């Protein structure tokens, strides 16, 4: 009967999409990876993103991050854990990009802050893929969402990110970071 909502969660056995949502079982494409990333040059993910947009003709993509997250912790620490270092170097660039903002916060609160920046940045990445641009620019309906789940509090009434167009992607992304920067 076909799925209508793509979820991109973290491999960290978190965002049991199934369970966190509770919508219609069978209408949820899922992809999971360490720190729930959308990297410009990742076939794996983009391939999913493609199948979901072009083929299954989906109109929603949630990227969902979470707090107390292994990728983020791994990303912030130094242990060279092999391949995963490469993968997380992308997250470390995000940390550098917002170093100033993060660069003044109880270090405890930094992991959770970075979890949030990240969800914004991946939506921003997602939104700049040819896949998605093409789709919008050809008049197809597609909405993007960035949410952060916490095991204690549920979903944070945060600067979510929300993008239904190239123009809205921008505002949203900016607003998101703008909003996170206040302290």
């Amino acid at each position: 009967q076909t799925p209508h909502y793509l979820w991109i969660g973290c491999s960290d056995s978190r965002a049991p999409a199934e369970k966190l949502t509770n919508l219609e079982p069978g209408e949820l494409f899922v992809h999971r990876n360490v720190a729930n990333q959308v990297i410009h040059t990742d076939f794996n993910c983009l391939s999913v993103v493609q199948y979901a947009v072009d083929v299954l003709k989906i109109e929603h993509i949630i990227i969902c991050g979470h707090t107390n997250c292994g990728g983020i912790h791994a990303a912030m620490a130094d242990k060279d854990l092999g391949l995963i270092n490469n993968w997380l170097l992308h997250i470390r660039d995000i940390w550098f990009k917002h170093g100033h903002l993060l660069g003044k916060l109880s270090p405890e609160k930094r992991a959770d802050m970075l979890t949030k920046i990240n969800v914004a940045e991946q939506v921003y990445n997602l939104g700049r893929t040819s896949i998605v641009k093409s789709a919008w620019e050809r008049g197809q309906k597609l909405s993007l969402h960035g949410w952060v789940y916490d095991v204690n509090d549920g979903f944070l009434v945060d600067q979510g990110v929300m993008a239904t167009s190239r123009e809205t992607l921008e505002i949203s992304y900016r607003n998101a970071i703008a909003r996170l920067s206040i302290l």
Copy 2:
């Protein structure tokens, strides 16, 4: 903290999550089109590293599934941009086992390839430095490969199942051998 890594297809019809009779939080999931493990795919090899090294998983399960979008698309003849690149890896497998699959009926192929695919992905899994090393340092790691027959409801052990490189060769070679009955 979880003992299994599940590697499923993005196609939505395999919710291992309950299927099994195990748990969540004991389940560390990665899902991608056609449920592949590609030699040079950082996305997935990354999931497999965190699994094997950080969490110290004991079982990695690759789960294929019948009438699968990915599999069908692979044999379809029509460009879908990026997804085609990703699916060429499954075409290579298709060609590999061509004779076998010619000796077969057009609509029955779908399913066969689904099986073969699982076999082949496990062989890929088991040749990764990651896995070959868990093994050499004597970590307990078993690799399992199943197809979910969405039609009959039940899963199905394909009996690829490996615990070492030697046990990897035997299952793989035996599986391919068996799928030319």
Copy 3:
């Protein structure tokens, strides 16, 4: 003034394209990588392949392998040399694909045989990229060549591979392997 011929050689300080060819300096796009591969899911290469076909509008791609080659040797040996193992696992699949044929040859002669299979297989890969298919199928001129260079003998008057269309790619590829199999 623009280039008209893409060369894909081996990173093994071999196929100094420049020098091996001697055509018009400035009209040679080059990419090099270990064992001179064209992998289905490699952005790096495909990106070059794209720039060259779509943008610079090239009409020739040589993939050039060579004999006594580090990638091939590495591929055939067992030392786990880290990342490169992953990369070469692709070459090892080619070895498995032609195991029977290789599987009866003075083991010395195997490395050179595999060097040749490889050049065929990469052309075959190249030829099945959307990039190239799209190009042909839209009536653009594009020729593909697979040659093997030897330091002692120069270019082997071998089953080269040669493909100007989807249909010719096939014949050529088959003919190539067919031809290599005789002993």
Copy 4:
């Protein structure tokens, strides 16, 4: 056997091969659009491993170049399929240093970004496990980053040049600092 690894752009105008005044056979070349080293790029990281570990190279040079196809295409606004994905990494760099590049003239950006790019690729190079490890086992490895100004004929030391992680920080930070004169 060779002592240098050269990492150039595919754009054809940088034939390091003679440019230098060194040699071939002492030169192990990898060329790709916009002369990038991406964190998760197996193609290139592979060249860099073979270089550093197998051949035991002493110098890795990343060479950018003025009016570069890749750089221009990055700032162009027009989809070119796959190449766009690859070029988003250079857009991210562009944005990163946006203010600097706004404070600048439309046609002069081209060149600046070319410089910045080199700076940033070297920083990428120097954060790879591969390189960070050569260093910890005390191998001699220096990383250099140059722009070839095709117009004036001459190369140009950008004076990113690193021999350790600490020496990597200093050059990088100093370079960016200097390119906001």
